[model samples]
Target chain A: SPAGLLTTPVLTGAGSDNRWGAQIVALQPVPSGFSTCNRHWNLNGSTFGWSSPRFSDIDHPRGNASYTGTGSTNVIETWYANTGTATNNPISNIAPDGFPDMGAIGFSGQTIPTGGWVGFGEVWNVANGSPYNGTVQAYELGFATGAPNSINPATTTVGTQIVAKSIYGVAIGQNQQTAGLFVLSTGIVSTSGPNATTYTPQPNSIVVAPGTPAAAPIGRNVPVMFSGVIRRAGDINAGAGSVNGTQYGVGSQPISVTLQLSLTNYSSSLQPGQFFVWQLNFASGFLEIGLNVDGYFYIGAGASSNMIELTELIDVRPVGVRPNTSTLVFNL
Target chain B: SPAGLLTTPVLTGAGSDNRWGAQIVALQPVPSGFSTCNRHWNLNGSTFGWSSPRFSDIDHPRGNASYTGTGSTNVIETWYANTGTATNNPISNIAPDGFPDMGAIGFSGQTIPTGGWVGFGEVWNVANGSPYNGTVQAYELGFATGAPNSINPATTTVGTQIVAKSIYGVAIGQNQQTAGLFVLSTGIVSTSGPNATTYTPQPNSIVVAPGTPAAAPIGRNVPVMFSGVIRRAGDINAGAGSVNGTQYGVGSQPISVTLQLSLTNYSSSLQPGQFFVWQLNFASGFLEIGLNVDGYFYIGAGASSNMIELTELIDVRPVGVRPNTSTLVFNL
Candidate 1:
């Protein structure tokens, strides 16, 4: 069996009397239709989801549609290659029920794995949990290909896959209950169970154009990153549990993003602490993103009245290849 | 017979000649009833002419009723009182014939003389030696009484008679014609014959009063004595016999008569050398007289020229009681 997928904490409540717990839900394959195992896992029905198992696939899998649960159980799964595989790997055996599996065969392709192998997935809840009475949904999973390959082409749909699992003994309801896929080696597994709560797209963190740490990886592109918290409408963080809701950081406050480019193309050396500010205006919904690097960075909710959100990344790279950092704030 | 009158020498000729001479023609006594001279004498012819014999009488004389003669050759007879009887010791007389004789004696108051005695007689000339035709004229005489008392009130005949004589071969005529009277033992006599020339009244020489030694008499109250030569209009005396019809002596000038009073009443002591100058004013027929003492005396001819007149006098009397020596010039 594949390594158990990662899980995050969950939230459950109504008005002020809500309860929450940590759990794992389902795992499913990526919709690539290739021979590699690519799957995703969902947790807490569809309110939280992730992908942990990955494999090479000739066809991208439809992980959200393969889920078999209804209402609170709506999830899917998929997988993709964890070490850049060239062909599919067959699953020759299965682990017994309630048992831990220790060894599995994976495939490799042309790209090298610089640090470790990981994956991501998505989840959605089509029950009454959505304030709009429609559905609450999330997606997670991505891959970086080498030069000469386009990144995650929406038309080709053949790249990687993910698998998912259910933890906390909720159900073995269906094999198609996973919503997305994430793949990783057993040595790189962070949590061993499924996460049925508190899983999302990580709030679409602010990403500057240049990545952090400044080192050029074999196939990864640099992107600036930012992270912050948010609260839903009429919700306060009382410091009980991890304070989970649709919290927001302010985007209209001052936020800085920075990038360093190589002097091989530019005639002057890069200077640290050089920065520019950017603000977020929500066009489709109440969401915002920003980036900054090597300078003062700030974020707040609803202009100055929301939470103080800040992040700093100083001189994280050499002059020739500097990192980019950004800060973002949100409004609910 | 009476003494015959004396004659004077010829000092002027007839007409405009200044030579004058005269001879007596008659002398007689008439009875009381006679108003004319009886027993008259004539000197020219012998009709009844008694010429030579000193006491002869004649009937009618000369060729005419008037007598005419020259020299002193006529005589008349008169009664004598001799020896205290009719002829006892009678007074003897001389006739004009140059002889002495006696004839008749008429009683007192029986005779009357024909010629006036109290005043001056008319003049005659004997140098013609015949037929005297001059008439007798009268003027004031200076004598107060007796014969030839020219100022006496009672006398009518000329004077007592006298005889002519040849003393030292100079025949004296027998009339009162010596220009002035001569005093004798008994009476006054004329040194010239009675028929001699007589002067008219010299109104300039008539003393109107008696003057003392300090002042001279003025006017017609007394006689004025003058002695000067008479001259013809153009004659100058050259020699005695020239007979150039010039005569020289003190006399009155032929102008209007005037006299002035100069009384020295201003001084107790009489002023000496007082004299007067009489000026003739032919135009006014008067004289302008100026009394001066101790200076020159002048007689003006017709108010234009001054001729020196008399220079000396024996006596002078002031007009008033006191002597006034002031020189006064006045008009008369």
Candidate 2:
């Protein structure tokens, strides 16, 4: 029954209460004076309308507040295929009237403000909800920041209304305006749901001995408390059948731990745990801890659910502590 | 007066012994043979003699062998002259033979044997044998050991008389018939009685040391004994000057002696005696020895003399004794 339930639910953002329902609100926003089809549109204070057809069409802001397109005009709608075809749109598609086609817009190029807009021709929705489908009209509209008007009179602001109408639906009820407003979203998709609950990580306790880090199971990125020696495995000896001889743990006795991140029937993948016995052979020695994830060995001690970062924890008391306790917190 | 007598007595052979009265005895036997005019005689199957009127002649045998002319033949007398004149009859009037040429008779080959005969042809009473002014002829006989004679005279059998005679009053004496013979005659004028006294050389001791022999002094033709210590000289630094700095007692130290027989002052003179000392300086750990003729330095024993030939008397012993001491000898 549990295996059946695991495969039964079409687990969506609703289960996690839309916790991961974030979306890219706006991408490359040409000024109100720009035209999507023409080589030039007056940015000298003329208003226009523009919207992306694909989800990836959202503008990626440079470290500064300038907006630049992520190469394609067709915004990807599917989460699994969020990366769209790498077709480059000329500056005529979004550039203001005076700007020249210098090349790909980067962080250094000029761009419109959040409320600015560029015009696309039009787009029509065939199915507004549930197995939603839509066809892009021959042209698009560009607008300033505001709620979308009727389809025939496509008037909307770039940030607040234009992206919302283009991604969701033009009708007020069809639009997930308030429900999906993620900061990293593309205009093609209305929302990004929370991850599935199929792979729940168990609470793990890593007991690092005087010279070794504790053990861990697969598919769990947990913060482990390391106090023991992290040593080269005895099986790594050259005399044994290892490909290369014991490489680490050559000098003064070392503490080491090995963890498996993913183990299958025929192969195993490892993520090095972050708990080190610092200067183990010397006096006043201490232990170091790191987070092991996705083949990266990171040092830190914090919540397990949040992106485990690499941080340093120095000199803890008690020379040799057995079964050292570690507390991990997970961010929602 | 003592110096004068000592110097004059040194002239006791040949010219000073004017008369046949000097009964010169041969240490070795005289060979029996006669060499006629312009011909060379073979003596004891070992050497040759010459006979030429107004030129040069050699009396056969040796010592005082008589020779009487039969007809008007000139006396067989040995003469040597560099004046290019045939009439230089007085024996002392002739200059000594130069190198590679020995009177009218040159050494035929490379070696000469001891006890070989060389003689003059004729004898006459220039002043009736009293202070005579007669020519005592002689030949320049080479003393190398391996030369061959042009006329190899058979060895003289015992009891064979070695003499030749002339009826014209030019007669060679008897009883003394070798080349190295002499007569003693006083200058007292006499009418008819004996005019000269003869004395002979008796057995005597002659000792030779480390030097070139009077005959062969260019190489190891004579024997010599050398004694010295093997010494290493110079600084013993690792780079430019490196020698054995450790000074051990002179037991088996190696010593090298080079015997050079060079010509000096146009005469065949000899220079021998070189000594070196092995010393180790404690300051720099360097070892060195003083070279020959250097100013007085610290020798293991004392100063070495160039002329002293006392080997057994030196308290210190050499590192090793070379049995082949003959390499020190040479002939000029």
Candidate 3:
């Protein structure tokens, strides 16, 4: 008897033990399933590749799914979908030639509209997790052409564009409800954890070097750009997002950027308020950094935290738009 | 034994299950009770009414809780909350005879600011959900006439406004910890389906004729009004909200619109990943669309799906200001 029909009293007002009997039980089903999406990987799995988000070339910018996931390791994440109005070139510089061509300042393509749901933002860095035991299989690939029952039945319509129809051969420890039911059935959310726990996606580029000042967690020196560059990995190699001498954007980048989280003595199953958060999407990410990016996904261990944060700011002020760390532009 | 605290292995390499005993666990919670919210409801069991989302017929222009909920369905929810800049009106669309006038027009009310959490986007269609099955009664109403607990008892004090003191008598399937502790204990999120879930409420009018082409997702076309409109089920007789033909002003009868989430293949228990999304007050109702209108929630099963998803283009750059498809008018 699931029993839950709503019940409190265990500790509504009790002191210590954090919360007395505690009594919480809401929504059910995550019994062992668990869910959360706001992902866009490729955080340095070797060459900045952290594969398997429902094996695909998908788009989930608005088709939804961006607050959860991980596991896997080889990454591709082709892009588009943050929400209509088009024009957003510079897919983190990956041109061995899989489409985003910029052999020379020419290569943007990612227009999207028809229910806009673009893709690509692999922040990578979650390695060697353990515990799923074996065969982890859970591969729900992208197939949401305009979405809804369309693994290819005439592509369900809506500006159409759906690919990767693979299934059951994937694994990252498997089943976070097939990674958000394959990101709502085919925008392809990922999976592959033997026990889902790992990290490491910082392939060199963490840029920022100008005068001196600051924004949040990381931002210093005015005329500053490169708050943490990762274009071709910096130094302005043919650049793209521009201004690498200082890297360019978001108030000239770095003054201090840290992520230590060792959180004590490992494995009893690493509990104490779950963990893992990387976010390097910089600008144009959290759906145009529209707001709510919060901070502190900590881990010295005993420091339980989660709230990554974003604030592209909007206060028509005369209505209310905010997020102008003077002038945010982390382009490169 | 649910241990999520954040960790990433050496870094994904060979790619077996994608990760190898990897480790990551952030934010923390859902050891059992998972949560997600952007709610504000009574979902029409009849009456745009429930009372207490702070009183005033008062609007939440910026008092608190527009859109954003949980990391832990069971635990990680830090403390007291349930809606934007925070005011949230909908004493439940009154005026079978409750405020919100316009038997004429001079009636125009509900403006709000301070934190600004306007309303309406009840996408409608959750006559019922069941994950909380059994006792289902989580009626938490708003009490931020300004905010500070203010549901009266001496205005808990912060800003202040507050009403209703009710106890139980409500149920829809109940308890995901009482639908978020009664939506943080009384912002009045809803639940139903012993039969509920109908839809209609477009009233006022539809507007438009010039060059035409609107409604379907990515969002934008701009120039809006009706900061709030309602009457229910119809064509255009005395109608409301205009400009091209003319009725104009909750600031300016609008000129744009969007919201889409099809995601298909239901029934396994309505599970590909759960369901339930309803947005009755449709447009003008979230207190004049001030902000935070999330998406996709449809119900008709054994376990209410959480509200669908959204964050609004973060209100077109500046990190989303929302509630203004351009001038947001929706008046009655």
Candidate 4:
């Protein structure tokens, strides 16, 4: 299959950051895995997934299916296993009753049988390839080499969300990677999940259709979120070489793909005017996209330290096959 | 319990399958268990996982999620963990929301925990895992176990995606069994979880080296998407047969092994292009490899029907290690 893309939406609004609210933050890298690996305690920044519930849906990334209870902003740091901290536990930061440790979820059923963590989750998203981003670096930070102080900030505001990362630390719960996280938007997230009165998501789509590379199967009224390649009637290339053809040249300027959000199961409350971000694994860095009230597509990359990634940048608007001149200015 | 598969890719392209714009659709036996629980209402389809935006990072699957406002997919046709109208929710489903709903991603904290939905999804593969192929199961005609008026719509499209599914009922949150699921492609879904997303991930390799089947030092890379034995490498058996006298007998078909997807901190803007997926876990059925792009790899047995799958099928390419044919094909 051609290269693939994994994308998700992000929730804003103070009230909807965590699952306690109406929306759910469908977290990133479900069933944890390494993005960039073994960089030692140097793991950098990472991205997480989330979704707001228009209808009190506790699907909030935080206090959600991944890290439940009081916390959402999580991190799974780790050093290379084997001779690593075989006895250390995941540097648990937010003591609040959140997702369980490996033991809690039963990491006992795993192989190589190292055994760690308090709880556990399922095993998902399996693939074969080389590392793509800085994700693995973060793992080294939290799970093994680095200290937990990397991102865990004290004195957080209400509904503050964070991307709880992963490391090669101890045995964790749920065989997933990153998760949509937030530090309890309101009511405390049970050491387990959300509160019965917290949220109740309404009808939504399950198929997150990839617009251009749209999978053969389509979706119904179900809300489908997808990404597409930005193109022009004419042929061109924005990467290293010119796209005399539709192929991305090696070392070329990283092409930008547009995300097509579908509102099939859309409701009156949904507002497409939300700020969104994008990344190509952990290596490609990160980028942001938004529908500022101005009605223009606000696209840019965050600062390096931000982890939002400014891998590449280029000319603005009407990015198409117009002239091979349009370039991507690497932003930071 | 060996080094499992870290499957699931977050896609931003409609070409990719799952929720949020282009996340790779990854489905496995929830936390490793059987499908179809002890229900009667008759479950339909389902897809789990949500995306919200906290910071605008495309880790939308992590935080900064969009595509939400107000809703609860609001159905409660389960045994009960919810305060739903009661007449709503999934039936027995594939006879499994199909996993051990407990560690099934923390189904706790949910209001009414009466969880159940129509579909499900996870950023699993970046490759060509056919969407027509049922990635999930558990559908019913009615929300109450009688009428087809439930989530299952009449006459479906060729390529449809449903996020419909079921729960064990009762305050069954963050514990066992399925919280939600999508038959694969066409549908909607929502459900309580069986576990929490706490336990930080560890440094396990996706090689599934078959570490004596254990879950200890986990990881972010190693897309451990797998299924156990099949057969025929050189038109010969291994287990009970002879590979220089190795023992993978005939009934033993030779378990070539599986890989795992690592999402520890994955990003689409990051583009690993690699793909991955998973089975119901080690036992639920394990199964993988790369972008053969061949009419989709239809590899597994459903707890019930396998329609949540396949909406498309195109070309076929080199699948994997041939003649050496460790064989990723799960025997029919």
Q: Which one is best on TM-score?
A: 4
- Span of ten consecutive residues with least summed lDDT in model 4 chain A: A247-256
Q: Which ten residues in a row have the lowest lDDT in candidate 2 chain A?
A: A250-259
lDDT, candidate 2, B1-332, per-residue tens: 00111111111111111111111111111011111111111111111111111111111112233333343212332221122121222221111111111111222222222222222112322212111112222222311211122322222112211222111121122222323212111101101111111111100111111221121111221111112111111110111111322111110001101000000021111112332222222222332222121111122211212112122121221222122222321111
lDDT of 3 at A312: 35
Q: What is the TM-score of each candidate against the true structure?
A: 0.15, 0.13, 0.18, 0.22
Deviation in Å, model 4, residue A47 alpha carbon: 14
Candidate 2 C-alpha error for residue B193, in Å? 44
lDDT of each prediction vs. the true structure?
0.18, 0.17, 0.17, 0.18
Q: Score the docking of each candidate (DockQ).
A: 0.00, 0.00, 0.01, 0.01
TM-score of chain B of 3: 0.18
Report the lDDT tens digits of candidate 3 across residue range A234-268.
Answer: 01121123332211111110111101111122223
Candidate 2, superposed: residue stretches over 4 Å from native = A1-332, B1-69, B78-135, B139-332
lDDT by residue (tens digit), candidate 3, B61-117: 111211113221111111123322233233332211111111111101121111111
Better of 1 and 2 by lDDT: 1
RMSD of 3: 26.1
Q: Is the docking of candidate 2 incorrect, acceptable, medium or high quality?
A: incorrect
Tens digit of per-residue lDDT, candidate 4, span A26-115? 221111111110100110111111121111111112121122223211223221111111121122222212221111111111111111
Give the TM-score, chain B only, in order for the candidates: 0.20, 0.18, 0.18, 0.19
Which sequence of candidate numbers ranks them by TM-score, best first? Answer: 4, 3, 1, 2
Give the interface RMSD of each candidate: 99.9, 72.2, 24.5, 21.0
Model 2 has a DockQ score of 0.00
Candidate 4, residue B278: the lDDT equals 29
